[PDB]
Amino acid sequence: PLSEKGNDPIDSSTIDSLCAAFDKTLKSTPDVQKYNDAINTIFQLRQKSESGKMPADLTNSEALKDRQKIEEILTRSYQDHSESRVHLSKLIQNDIPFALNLFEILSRSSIHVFVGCFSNKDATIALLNELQIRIHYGEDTHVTYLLSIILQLLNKFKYNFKEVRFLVKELILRISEDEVKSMMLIIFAELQSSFQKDFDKAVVDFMSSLIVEAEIDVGNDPLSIIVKTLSELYPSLTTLCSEIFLTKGLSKLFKKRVFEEQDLQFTKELLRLLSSACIDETMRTYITENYLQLLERSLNVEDVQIYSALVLVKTWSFTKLTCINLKQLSEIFINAISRRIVPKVEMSVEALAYLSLKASVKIMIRSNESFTEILLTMIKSQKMTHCLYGLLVIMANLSTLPEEXXXXXXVGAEKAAKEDILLFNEKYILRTELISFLKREMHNLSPNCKQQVVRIIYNITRSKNFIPQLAQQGAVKIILEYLANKGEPIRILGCRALTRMLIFTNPGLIFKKYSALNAIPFLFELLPRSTPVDDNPDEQIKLTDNYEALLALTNLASSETSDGEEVCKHIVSTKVYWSTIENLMLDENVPLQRSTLELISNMMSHPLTIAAKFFNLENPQSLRNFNILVKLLQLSDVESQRAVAAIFANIATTIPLIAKELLTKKELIENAIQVFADQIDDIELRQRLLMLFFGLFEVIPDNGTNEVYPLLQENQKLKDALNMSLKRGDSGPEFSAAIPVILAKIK
């Protein structure tokens, strides 16, 4: 040792034991007293008699300083050490009320610390107990905070309901208060998906308690709590509420309180229910069968005219009453929405989004130019979120014009509104550059809102003239970017839209930036398919669409832009797209078969993409297609012969080798010759046929003698039919010099 060495020995043992007790307090977790010390200090404040009432030194308003200070000291002792954390939980669970008084006036974020001090579910019961209380008595100011503890207390444990069921009662019992009603929907959503029918029924059970109370004529005023709770929880538990809204005598009890009593305020409250219940076609009908006389006499007091009407509209009960008519009935919503009574502005839209379905209204609205202007402004600038859908729905029903041998006999009333509608649209939709406007806000529009934009556009395309202008405003952008999402009917309608537009516009002035192969997928959807449909439910693809899409499809081929080669390539390429156009080439239906031939015709101008499909001829497939074309050379439908002739005309020139090979083919030659002479009448058809001949003889050596070609060399029909052409007329400005050069090779 060192200390046992001397006249005053201290035996090194009394020294270890010494540093041991100096080392024990020097080895175990630092700053814990300080923390628990500071905490106790805070918890000292509690000694203020009346339930540790928070002395107003702290509550007040400028005291935010002194609080933030307390919230930190608490959080500290809580998130640094476990020992300090454990302390804070003991002092809190020890005086749970005070504990609550203390925290309430702290930040919302402080809750995680209060709850984080509750170790296991069991320990939280003395707590839920106070909570049922503070809530029931409505004494405590800050409900939002107490109920936020609830929501977190819930989300953090696995409760049994037998322990939280009190929420239903206590929360419903305060439905009147917006601070609660709000925290209720939340706390309820949880309770729902966590106790399903166990909750689902405890609610119906409580509510039943209220309807019984109202039946006996006892209570704080049941009926109101009920009505208010029903309308409020209707969206959340649609199914449920109805199972209560029906309840035998309830339907009576409401009415009695509304008739044999003023309660103007109660009345209004009921009308807010009737409207909230308008879900399944059943309730709507129920509401009519049971609450019609109400809605009727209600429309007398302004305080309940809007709430009444809206019900009559959303239920269609207006079609009964001898006191109003569609004209007046709607004037109410048009009246108010004229930058006036803001409280009505929203529901009058929703109302008018319906009424603007029966034309009587449609006509009416496109007349009142001012209202239309308010609406137009109401959509754009306004940025009145929820009012958009209806305003956009009204702006779809408004722009909706009816869809529609020789008749030289003697009716034309339909030219009335037709005109009006194409007027309206051009006036307020196209000029107001509204389509252009929507182009920008599109990204944000609610899914539903978007759809209305697709209808507005679709309604514009019904009349070709507008297509051009509607294009610069970015429509083809809208529709196409939309179609790049999800098999609903709206989609086949926006598809039709896209097609009508690509038919009447220039592929350059549009796909001058965002490529074209993007439109192809959509166009084909309006054509037949060998693949197991798309999504499947419900709307059909009329034959008229096959025609329309074909027209637009051809257009996108015409262009001699490098983009065109690109388009054509894509078509003849994608095995499915070609297997389709190939089949439609043999369609017995004429508009189809010709447009398809007109498509192929155009594609042929960018050879390397389709050529090998008809003029290869070493290929069974091409040869097949080759002969088909040679027969269609003599189709009744003259507009098709032109296309077929066109085809043969081009490649025969564009690719000499082929021309030479055609000199061998009989039926090709015999037909081309015949129709050429038997239909010299047609100007295009002959103009075409001549080119073929210019090109064919073009690969026929004159001095070459050695090898000759009869069918064209001789054939008096062609020979003389060539001369009849030569005998002035419409031989064409160019292809004239050819005629004699050609006879220069005949016998």
The data reach a resolution, in angstroms, of 2.9
Q: What is each CA distance from 101 to 131, 164, 704, in whole angstroms?
A: 12, 22, 115
Secondary structure class of 31 (helix, strand, coil): coil
Environment class of 152 (CB within 10 Å of its CB; exposed 0-12, middle 13-18, buried 19+): middle
Q: How far apart are CA 27 and CA 19, in angstroms?
A: 11
In 25-108, which residue ranges form alpha helices assigned H by DSSP? Answer: 32-42, 64-79, 82-94, 96-104
Tokens of 649: 């005309």
Q: How far apart are CA 210 and CA 715, in angstroms?
A: 103
Nearest CA-CA partner of 394 in 332, 456, 461: 456
CB atoms within 10 A of CB 68: 12
Environment class of 509 (CB within 10 Å of its CB; exposed 0-12, middle 13-18, buried 19+): exposed
Secondary structure class of 405 (helix, strand, coil): coil
Q: How far apart are CA 606 and CA 612, in angstroms?
A: 12
3-state SS record for 130-191: HHHHHHHHCCCCCHHHHHHHHHHHHHHCCCCCCCCCHHHHHHHCCCCCHHHHHHHHHHHHHH
Residue 495: which residues within 8 A CB-CB, separation 6 or more? 483, 522, 525, 526
Direct distance between the N- and C-terminal alpha carbons of the chain, in angstroms, rounded to an integer: 142
Contact 699/658 with Cβ under 8 angstroms?
no
Tokens of 200: 């689902």
Q: How far apart are CA 401 and CA 477, in angstroms?
A: 23
Contact 496/548 with Cβ under 8 angstroms?
yes
Residue type, 632: L
b/e code 493-506 from CB counts within 10 Å (16+ = b): bbbbbbbbbbbbbe
Please provide residue 421's backbone torsions phi and psi, each rounded to the nearest 5 degrees: -65, -45
Residue 652: which residues within 8 A CB-CB, separation 6 or more? 658, 659, 662, 691, 692, 695, 696
Q: How far apart are CA 693 and CA 678, in angstroms?
A: 16
Tokens of 680: 């010299």
Please provide residue 10's backbone torsions phi and psi, each rounded to the nearest 5 degrees: -125, 15
Tokens of 94: 């020890």
Domains defined along the chain, listed by start: 1-289 (1.25.10.100), 290-747 (1.25.10.10)
CB atoms within 10 A of CB 697: 23
In 516-637, which residue ranges form alpha helices assigned H by DSSP? Answer: 519-525, 543-558, 562-573, 575-583, 590-604, 620-631
Residue type, 234: Y
Q: What is each CA distance from 285 to 238, 269, 657, in whole angstroms?
A: 16, 20, 77
Contact 83/32 with Cβ under 8 angstroms?
yes
Residues present in the chain in total: 747
Longest dimension (CA), the chain: 154
Tokens of 457: 């556009």
Tokens of 245: 């809204």
Nearest CA-CA partner of 656 in 596, 716, 711, 611: 611
Residue type, 321: L
Tokens of 308: 């009444």
